Amino acid sequence: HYDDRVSENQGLVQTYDHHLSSILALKYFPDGSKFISSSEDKTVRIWENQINVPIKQISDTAQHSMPFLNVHPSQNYFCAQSMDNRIYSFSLKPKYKRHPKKIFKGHSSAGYGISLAFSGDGRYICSGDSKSRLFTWDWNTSRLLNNIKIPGNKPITQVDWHPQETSKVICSGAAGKIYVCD
Amino acid sequence: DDDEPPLSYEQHIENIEPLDPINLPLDSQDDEYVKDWLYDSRPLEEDS
Amino acid sequence: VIQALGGIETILEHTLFKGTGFNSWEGLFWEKASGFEDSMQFKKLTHAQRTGLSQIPNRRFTLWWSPTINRANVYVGFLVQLDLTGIFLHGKIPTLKISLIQIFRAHLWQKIHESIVFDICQILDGELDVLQIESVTKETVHPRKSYKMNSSAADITMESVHEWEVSKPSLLHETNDSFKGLITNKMWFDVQLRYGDYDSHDISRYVRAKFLDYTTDNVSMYPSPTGVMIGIDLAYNMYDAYGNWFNGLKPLIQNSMRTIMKANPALYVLRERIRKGLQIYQSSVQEPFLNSSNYAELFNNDIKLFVDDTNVYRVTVHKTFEGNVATKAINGCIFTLNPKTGHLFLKIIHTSVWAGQKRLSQLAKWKTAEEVSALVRSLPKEEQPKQIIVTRKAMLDPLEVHMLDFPNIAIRPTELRLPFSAAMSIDKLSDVVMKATEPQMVLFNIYDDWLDRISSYTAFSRLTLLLRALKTNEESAKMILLSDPTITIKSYHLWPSFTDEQWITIESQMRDLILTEYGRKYNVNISALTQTEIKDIILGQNIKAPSVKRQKMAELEAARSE
Amino acid sequence: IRACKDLKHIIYYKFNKNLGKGPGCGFWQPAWRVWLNFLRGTIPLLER
Amino acid sequence: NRPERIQEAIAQDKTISVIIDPSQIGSTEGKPLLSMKCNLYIHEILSRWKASLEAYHPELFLDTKKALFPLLLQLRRNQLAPDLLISLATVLYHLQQPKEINLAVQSYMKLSIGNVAWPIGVTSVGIHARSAHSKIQGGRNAANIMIDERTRLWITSIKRLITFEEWYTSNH
Amino acid sequence: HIPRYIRNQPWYYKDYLVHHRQKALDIDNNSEPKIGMGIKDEFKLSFCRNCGEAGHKEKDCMEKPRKLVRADWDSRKDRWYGYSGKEYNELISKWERDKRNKLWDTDEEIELMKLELYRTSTRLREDKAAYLNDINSTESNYDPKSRLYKTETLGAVDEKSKMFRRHLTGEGLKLNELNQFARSHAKEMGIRDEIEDKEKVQHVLVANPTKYEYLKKKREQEE
Amino acid sequence: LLIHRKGLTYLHLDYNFNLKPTKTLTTKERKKSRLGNSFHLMRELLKM
RNA sequence: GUAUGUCUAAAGUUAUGCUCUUAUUUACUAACAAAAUCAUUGAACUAG
Numbered sequence A: 001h002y003d004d005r006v007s008e009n010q011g012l013v014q015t016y017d018h019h020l021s022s023i024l025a026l027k028y029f030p031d032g033s034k035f036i037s038s039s040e041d042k043t044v045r046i047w048e049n050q051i052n053v054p055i056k057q058i059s060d061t062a063q064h065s066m067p068f069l070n071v072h073p074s075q076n077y078f079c080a081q082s083m084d085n086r087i088y089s090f091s092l093k094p095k096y097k098r099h100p101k102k103i104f105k106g107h108s109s110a111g112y113g114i115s116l117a118f119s120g121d122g123r124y125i126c127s128g129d130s131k132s133r134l135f136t137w138d139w140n141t142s143r144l145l146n147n148i149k150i151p152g153n154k155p156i157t158q159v160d161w162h163p164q165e166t167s168k169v170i171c172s173g174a175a176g177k178i179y180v181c182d
Numbered sequence B: 001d002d003d004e005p006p007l008s009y010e011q012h013i014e015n016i017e018p019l020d021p022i023n024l025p026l027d028s029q030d031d032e033y034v035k036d037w038l039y040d041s042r043p044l045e046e047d048s
Numbered sequence C: 001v002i003q004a005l006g007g008i009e010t011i012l013e014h015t016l017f018k019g020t021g022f023n024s025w026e027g028l029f030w031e032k033a034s035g036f037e038d039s040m041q042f043k044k045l046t047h048a049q050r051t052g053l054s055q056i057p058n059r060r061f062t063l064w065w066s067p068t069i070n071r072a073n074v075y076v077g078f079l080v081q082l083d084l085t086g087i088f089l090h091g092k093i094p095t096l097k098i099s100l101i102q103i104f105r106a107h108l109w110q111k112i113h114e115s116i117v118f119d120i121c122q123i124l125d126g127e128l129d130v131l132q133i134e135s136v137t138k139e140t141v142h143p144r145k146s147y148k149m150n151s152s153a154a155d156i157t158m159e160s161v162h163e164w165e166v167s168k169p170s171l172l173h174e175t176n177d178s179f180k181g182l183i184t185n186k187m188w189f190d191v192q193l194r195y196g197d198y199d200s201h202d203i204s205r206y207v208r209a210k211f212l213d214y215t216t217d218n219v220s221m222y223p224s225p226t227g228v229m230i231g232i233d234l235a236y237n238m239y240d241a242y243g244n245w246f247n248g249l250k251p252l253i254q255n256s257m258r259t260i261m262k263a264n265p266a267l268y269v270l271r272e273r274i275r276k277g278l279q280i281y282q283s284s285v286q287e288p289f290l291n292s293s294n295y296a297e298l299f300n301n302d303i304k305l306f307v308d309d310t311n312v313y314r315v316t317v318h319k320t321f322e323g324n325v326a327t328k329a330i331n332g333c334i335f336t337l338n339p340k341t342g343h344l345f346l347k348i349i350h351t352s353v354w355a356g357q358k359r360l361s362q363l364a365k366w367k368t369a370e371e372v373s374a375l376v377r378s379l380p381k382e383e384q385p386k387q388i389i390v391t392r393k394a395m396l397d398p399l400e401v402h403m404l405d406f407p408n409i410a411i412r413p414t415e416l417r418l419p420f421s422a423a424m425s426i427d428k429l430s431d432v433v434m435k436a437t438e439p440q441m442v443l444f445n446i447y448d449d450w451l452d453r454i455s456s457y458t459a460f461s462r463l464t465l466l467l468r469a470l471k472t473n474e475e476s477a478k479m480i481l482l483s484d485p486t487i488t489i490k491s492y493h494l495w496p497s498f499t500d501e502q503w504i505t506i507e508s509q510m511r512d513l514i515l516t517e518y519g520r521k522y523n524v525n526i527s528a529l530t531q532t533e534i535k536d537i538i539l540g541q542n543i544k545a546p547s548v549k550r551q552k553m554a555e556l557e558a559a560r561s562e
Numbered sequence D: 001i002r003a004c005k006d007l008k009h010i011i012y013y014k015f016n017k018n019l020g021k022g023p024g025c026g027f028w029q030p031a032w033r034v035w036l037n038f039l040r041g042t043i044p045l046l047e048r
Numbered sequence E: 001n002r003p004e005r006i007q008e009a010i011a012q013d014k015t016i017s018v019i020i021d022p023s024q025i026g027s028t029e030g031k032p033l034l035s036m037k038c039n040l041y042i043h044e045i046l047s048r049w050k051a052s053l054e055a056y057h058p059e060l061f062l063d064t065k066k067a068l069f070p071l072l073l074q075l076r077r078n079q080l081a082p083d084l085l086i087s088l089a090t091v092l093y094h095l096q097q098p099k100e101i102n103l104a105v106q107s108y109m110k111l112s113i114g115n116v117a118w119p120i121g122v123t124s125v126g127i128h129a130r131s132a133h134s135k136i137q138g139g140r141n142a143a144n145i146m147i148d149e150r151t152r153l154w155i156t157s158i159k160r161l162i163t164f165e166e167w168y169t170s171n172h
Numbered sequence F: 001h002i003p004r005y006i007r008n009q010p011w012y013y014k015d016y017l018v019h020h021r022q023k024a025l026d027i028d029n030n031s032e033p034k035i036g037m038g039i040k041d042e043f044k045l046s047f048c049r050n051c052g053e054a055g056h057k058e059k060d061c062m063e064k065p066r067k068l069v070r071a072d073w074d075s076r077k078d079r080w081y082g083y084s085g086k087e088y089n090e091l092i093s094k095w096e097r098d099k100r101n102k103l104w105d106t107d108e109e110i111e112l113m114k115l116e117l118y119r120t121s122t123r124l125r126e127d128k129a130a131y132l133n134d135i136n137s138t139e140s141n142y143d144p145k146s147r148l149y150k151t152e153t154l155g156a157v158d159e160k161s162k163m164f165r166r167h168l169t170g171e172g173l174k175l176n177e178l179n180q181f182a183r184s185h186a187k188e189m190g191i192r193d194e195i196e197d198k199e200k201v202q203h204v205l206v207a208n209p210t211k212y213e214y215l216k217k218k219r220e221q222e223e
Numbered sequence G: 001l002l003i004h005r006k007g008l009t010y011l012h013l014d015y016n017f018n019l020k021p022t023k024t025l026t027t028k029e030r031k032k033s034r035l036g037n038s039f040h041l042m043r044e045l046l047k048m
Numbered sequence H: 001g002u003a004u005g006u007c008u009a010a011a012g013u014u015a016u017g018c019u020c021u022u023a024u025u026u027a028c029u030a031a032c033a034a035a036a037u038c039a040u041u042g043a044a045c046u047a048g
Ligand SMILES: O=P(O)(O)O[C@H]1[C@H](OP(=O)(O)O)[C@@H](OP(=O)(O)O)[C@H](OP(=O)(O)O)[C@@H](OP(=O)(O)O)[C@H]1OP(=O)(O)O
Pocket: D005, D008, D012, D016, D020, D021, D022, D023
């Protein structure tokens, strides 16, 4: 943790060290009081700003490592792309338990750091796919509504949904070119 | 001492003149036959 | 059977009794009904942990008879020196070994040696003109010298202004030494510690033997062939000296060794540890603990510090991969407060302190004592505290050992249960402690600026109410403190900038929260209690303590008066 | 070890008849023999 | 010529000011100037204690000067190690500010004890020996207050100076 | 209390424990540190065919064949038993023979002028332990346990309970007097003690510190 | 040389043939450095 | 508290109904914790 205003030690104001393997993803809470972290150690941890103590630890026998993290527009839940080709969801309120029903399945992502995004209104969730496609699911029922094929025949690791447009999404990956879907 | 390394014979012992051994003073007449050789390392070794 | 064994005298000669310093054999009341193993037998323990509890009483028994169990007159037995001590075990006896290790733990043997050496140095430092000493030098001996039992070195060397007419080597109490003849300009002192046994405990022959052996030995060690060999037998509380004497030195060493043996605190620590190892106790308290009856002494002009270890070792619990829950250490702090000025020396105990260590509950007490010692050494003599108030019994022994380097600092226990543990409820202190990235000392005035308007005892009482309230119910106490959003807590402050008129209302709300929750929890009618009982509730006075009895009489005598 | 203790007993009481207690008996030949015979049997054991 | 060089040095000493700057603290190139500036500010404090000797602990002044002598000598010679100079300079800097006495005392605690995990260390505190205990024994890894008795003497004299500056600034 | 089997005295004997008081070890004053017992290297004092002297046979003779004695484990093991200075005299003669056989640098001067002048152990050498001042006396002021150094200036012994009480100084007196003030105020306001009044909590000093301090500060101007 | 070939550098053999650890050993180091009677008997003979 | 196991991540470059908010119940785990009746004493101590 750095604070560019501080010149001491180049601004390194805090170090979090409870993870045991390479960090995979980082994501702040919308209010910036806490942040989420994922690691190759197969655990997810929640931290208070500048305090080297994880307030929550998310780990399970069947839980795979989560290469990507994002927060739902409502600020009530966060989602994690998992190596088991699934997307899980977790509450953003104390104890942060895993949501037993909001699980999105269908795409392929094992072996790739594939990002996931939410529609501007939070009505939908979407993600890339290792076989050059863009999946999209309904946020309420988690039902897969579409899987658009993206040119280039390469993994589409980058996906983002426009914060104001009703349906414009951008994606890219190993093909190099950036594509817009609508 | 446990920390003291064994002394070098040629540097610390070989040059010091040895002290007297335990030799009971023999009588010139009562020990005439033994006096000249009793305390040798191998008494009479050279006497054929 | 007592008569057949030769009476109490003969029986006790086989025991460690003389080393305990206990006054009389009559007071030898063994606490046959309490001990650690008695507290442990009910707990959730594994079969291994239960079988291991029997070692404790066996250790006590072995320690009591240790002078006989480790006697020198044995049929066979290679001498094995016990680590960090000058004790030799004539055989491998694990139960004895471990009990002796428990007594000499925290490097006590080396501390005793240095303490006595410093005492002799400090005495000689005042006799420069009387004894015609040009200078006194405390030698930079090898770190293990105090338990190097086959050779030695001078601990102290003194240079004369002119020269001294020294007698032949003689015992400390030998009368009429001839000072004529031998003359020397440099004299040395060597303090030898030993641990006698039932066969070998004649300290006089020991000191003579050490003096003659080390002076005649071919080793280059002493700066001159003239000096004094001082010997102390730790197992038998015996002392003697042998060496050259000059006019006036012998009487001085006789008087000083008698005083050092009686008053030196390191030897006292050794005696108390032996008694603890035996579970024998004597009521030897000369000054009363800090109590609700004498707490006004806190505000005396003498410098004093409260020390609280409660937050030194702190842990968070998390689920392990195996399915258990593991404790992980987090940042802690040592609460050191001067109640007169309000200066709080908050030592942040960063997690890196515990890296790779186990048995942290124990190590944290030693860490607290070590940081207190570092703080004291960081203060100039005129600023060092005259007394340190130990809020928890667990800290007494570690601090007593670490304070052997500061023999003028009185250690004072307390009968109070002061709420300093609730200091981590103060948002600013919690923040500073939890965000620290390295070991650090942070200073705060726990009274902020109240001292410009109220007395120190008033500030301490206000602080006590705020802390005891936070300890009683943190959320409702915080609700009281933050009841008005206009009263901003300034920077460089811990509490809101209330005026004293507002402080009276805050104190009333805190007081009521504390007393109503106490009355509810214990079903005590606060209205029936006496003024002193209410005081004892806010201060947390131990109701079982004798001071409550004596204070009751100190007021019922007035109830007789008029 | 017992043999040497026994030898010391018989040796000292012969040696000290009109001398009393204290160091000075240097008749090491019998105990020395005891240890040489110990080595005779210890040799094959330690070699193996 | 000893008196000539001495008077020239006592004169040259006045060509620089004692005011410390937070950016100068820790400058490798400016280290000699900061070291001299620190020595000079210490002398300034001592001159004010000399000016108030009969009102504030006269018996301690002599011992304080005798203890500060090795520090001042090393500062003149720029021999004081970088870490020690940075700490000392931080103390004197806070001491020069209008009302930062507590910050000066915190910086002094950083100078004396510092950030070492075990300022003094502990040896065999229990009956269960472990290899890890060798680390916490301290020794060479101890705090600055443990380097040697001369260092403790001058460091605590600096503390005594902070206490004097507090007394002086409050009465005057 | 002492058990019956200790208190009871064997018939052959006849203090209540006199049979066990015979008491080197002193079971009655075991707290006193003991000086060494001193060194006493004491010594005591048919015709033989070989030497003529009577009392031994030929084989036991100390004369070559022809034609004082020593008086505790430590005593027996002392390798210096019977020593009379020989080894130390030799050492001293050797040392006596070898004895007979054989500025400031401007920086220091400028600093001394400006000052008007002319690992390691934790203990401070100049910080003399208080008990070291009492070596020339029999009484002990220093408590080795608490490290308290008793003085008439610091406090006084109560004698009734043998405890030592620190005198009150400065703000300590102020608090003790404020304590008295609140206590009187309790009797004054009528809350008193025997009466189970709810208002009592309002008149406890520690429970109402700022109130009573300001209240005394007020009344002090009226006295 | 035997001690060092086994990697037991944490065991120091004194010049009087005492064998002591130079630090507190881990349980694995203790198990690995558990020398047998042949070594210890040889060492005691060298000590004598 | 152990045995014991695992980790240590640049470079020293090999050529191309079903949920949620939240107040509880129950179980398991915690060498975390000096807990106020029954002249001040469980107290640093227990492991296959
Ligand atoms: O214990 P004691 O009955 O008094 O006998 C001792 C003892 O010999 P033992 O115990 O083996 O019989 C000594 O041996 P250590 O205790 O030292 O092992 C020995 O002295 P040494 O060391 O020279 O062997 C000494 O002999 P001395 O007559 O010279 O005193 C001898 O005494 P006694 O056998 O004459 O009683």
